[PDB]
Amino acid sequence: LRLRVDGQTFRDPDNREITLRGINVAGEAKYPKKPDIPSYVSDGFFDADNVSFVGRPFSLDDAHTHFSRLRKWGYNTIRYVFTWEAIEHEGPGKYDDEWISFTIEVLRIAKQYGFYVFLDPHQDVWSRLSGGSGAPAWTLYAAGFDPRGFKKTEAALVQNTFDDPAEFPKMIWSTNYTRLVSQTMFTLFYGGRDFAPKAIIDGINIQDYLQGHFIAACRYFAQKIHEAGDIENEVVIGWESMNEPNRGLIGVQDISVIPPEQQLQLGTSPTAFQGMLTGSGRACEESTWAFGGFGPYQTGRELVDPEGETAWLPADYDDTRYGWVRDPGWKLGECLWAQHGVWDPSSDKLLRKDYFAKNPQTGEPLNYDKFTNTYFMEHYRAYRDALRSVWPEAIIFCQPPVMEVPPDLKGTVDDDPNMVHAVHYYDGITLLTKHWNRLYNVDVIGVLRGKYLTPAFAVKIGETAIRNCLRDQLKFLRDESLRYMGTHPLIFTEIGIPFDMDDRHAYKTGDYSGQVSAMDANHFAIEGSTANGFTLWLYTTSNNHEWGDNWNGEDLSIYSVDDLELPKLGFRAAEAWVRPSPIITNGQILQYGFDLKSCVFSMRLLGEKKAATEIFLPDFHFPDTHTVVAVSAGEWTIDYPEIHSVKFQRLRWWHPEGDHNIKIQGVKRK
């Protein structure tokens, strides 16, 4: 077997600790292959019916060629991106065995390169019909509300629908989490017995139907891995929960106003009631909000007029498509929350301001921690046991909601010694402003958890203080992980920077200085966070300068078909994310890092009795003729191991037991 969990560390068969420097592969699994429907093409979007993700990311011939890149860049892990839509697209229980068979073929090509792969059931604002990716289309018809009218009802601002796809608002897809469809789907997914207790399919609640199929669609895809025989523990080490779990409306103390914890707006900003009227064809005046130095920004209101057409399936449209039972309680043509007594369609006025406020069964007041410790963990325990009904030795990458307190599983029955805490972190300023500010940055984590009062005691000035701020944020998350969940490993499964900074300034000049300072600062935070590894958010094989990641106007891929590789076109800040890093360490890593300015790699460890320390050294930064190695104890050699013709320089450092450290200096560049 490739890797085992042994507390806070991953260990190889000979007791050496493994460091997971990985990357997400790939952002192309978010949308189908035949027809190739990215975020900007509009024809054929709505007849999802039959899709064919057979092919995404890439055709199998290019697999061994594409995998070779990730070894050359020093990556040893891959977060394999796949959607629930890729498994159960035709309908409930209709699994794409052709997609399964083709995907099993992908893994061994990657296994030939000695990768570590954990599978990611990715999603963004629920479904691709809802302005993102993830869940299949029939899940929306199960809740029933046909995406045709979504345009100006403004439930999920879809990009495959706007008049001009090139004019899709930047970073507006993430706003859908606070809109009608995504607030409804996640609420029904994690707890339908609670807020919409009339949703009964197959005699069971919508909570049990949406979860039961996602739990089963992954379990059936996992049962093939048991029968494959050559990919369990030999390349596939386990699974992840679900990408960025959202609560929807579970815990909204007042649905008539924007909650103070909702810090993202932009586009139209409907409340739950303003989102309720709009999803029923009425009319609302909504404040519109935006972006630093661009967009609405304390805007001036805008009137939304769907004009008599709802964001719901009509009362008579044919459902009889894929099996089908509904209890007569669940209706069509009317608002779901309206029939449950949340609001009156005849008078257009709320019930009150606290339907989504307290506990379904006992009446305890809801918050985000209450949602994370109950309904999310309720969905997580079943997903954990379902994957272990097939493969009990499966490592489960537990991903709680983004930038929220992880569940308190330390000392409970869920203190799983084969679990991994997956944490997301994005520089909220640079990601949303698309500009690396070299002058200030905010301790976002410190503000969210209440370390300081308001974002005024927290902000730090100076690029050095900014670097230390990000590292102490990621370091704090590791201490929060070890406090609530126990002695378990942590993997920063998503972290990156937007490459389209300063109005495509790097694409116009080749000056990637902003992206270099952003990537080096983000990696500097990871290297000092005392974490167990990371996967940079997103390697796209079809990323270009025009469409970015070909998904929601984002441009986060480190690889581009229009940029040059490392030996007026730049290198896409490649010199910033091709870093020396530990691969496998003879003992516990005390501290390591890469100073990109001085081109100096240093690592301090606590040696164990014999078993080597294997470190990746980039060819660009560390040429063999000019690389200078210095050790505090022991001996070292430098080789060029070959893994299917793929070449990368590696240094092995044999040291005795005790406190030792190394300093590797390369070539400085401007």
Residue numbers in the entry: 4 to 570, 627 to 669, 675 to 734
Task: Show the paper's wording.
To meet this need, we propose a new class of antifungals targeting sterylglucosidase (SGL), an enzyme present in fungi but not in human cells. SGL participates in the metabolism of sterylglucosides (SGs), of which ergosterol 3β-d-glucoside (ErgGlc) is the major species in fungi. ErgGlc synthesis involves a sterol glucosyltransferase that adds a single glucose moiety to the 3β-hydroxy group of ergosterol, whereas SGL hydrolyzes ErgGlc to glucose and ergosterol. Here, we developed Af sterylglucosidase A (SglA) as a therapeutic target.
Full-length A. fumigatus SglA was produced in Escherichia coli and purified using affinity and gel filtration chromatographies. Moreover, the full-length protein yielded crystals that diffracted to a 3.8-Å resolution. Molecular replacement with the Cn Sgl1 model was used for solving the SglA structure. The general architecture of SglA was similar to that of Sgl1, with two domains, comprising a catalytic domain with a central TIM (triose-phosphate isomerase) barrel and a C-terminal β-sandwich domain. SglA also contains a large catalytic domain that forms a cap-like region above the TIM barrel, creating an enclosed Y-shaped cavity, which differentiates Af SglA and Cn Sgl1 from the bacterial and human homologs that display glucosylceramidase activity. The surrounding active-site residues in the glucose binding site are present in the same position as Sgl1 and contain the same capping residues, including a bulky Trp residue that creates a wall to sterically hinder substrates with more than one sugar from binding. Interestingly, there are slight differences in the composition of active site residues in the sterol binding site, where there is an exchange in positions between methionine and leucine on opposite sides of the pocket. However, in SglA, there are minor structural differences with Cn Sgl1 that leave a wider opening to the pocket. The position of this modeled loop does not block the active site, leaving the active site solvent exposed in SglA. To aid future medicinal chemistry optimization, we used in silico analysis to dock hit B and hit C into the SglA active-site pocket, since our efforts to cocrystallize SglA with both hit compounds have so far been unsuccessful.
